[PDB]
Design a binder for this molecule. Structure first.
Ligand SMILES: [Ca+2]
Ligand SMILES: [Ca+2]
Lengths: 87, 87
């Protein structure tokens, strides 16, 4: 079980999987996730993904609790930090 | 659906709408919300707005879960950071 983040719409392009945790921009980059890059994601059942517009879990927050082929026009290519929960 | 913050009592004066997220003072300013300015707000049903006296989600916290024509004497013109939840 992991959250997989995808570069392109409908789970296309480059992908990176992450376990639960609170990942800053620098930490995302080390995990090979660039800024302003995420477009779709797969979320395990029962899990929560809080996607933040700015670093350090600030700015607009978009929340996903299931597989999402398109994050929305506002959220597209905006992720700079993320909190992942298995609850 | 958005939280709309208003300059004056009873939803008067300048207004700015924000999606869920954790907004610092600088982020509020970029969204055109000055410090010590907010007097009333509209909150979508089921949402929570935590209004903080100081930057970075510290100091006194005032909580609103419905449309509020007057934030209260203590809370008036004090917002410097805010957390908005759709839950
Ligand atoms: Ca993309
Ligand atoms: Ca005011």
């Amino acid at each position: 079980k992991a959250v997989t983040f995808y570069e392109d719409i409908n789970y296309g392009g480059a992908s990176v999987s992450l376990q639960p945790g609170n990942y800053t921009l620098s930490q995302l980059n080390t995990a090979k996730i660039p800024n302003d890059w995420m477009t779709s994601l797969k979320v395990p059942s029962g899990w929560t993904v809080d996607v933040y517009e700015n670093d350090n879990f600030t700015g607009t927050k978009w929340t996903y609790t299931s597989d999402t082929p398109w994050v929305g026009n506002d959220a597209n290519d905006k992720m700079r930090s993320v909190k992942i929960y298995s609850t």
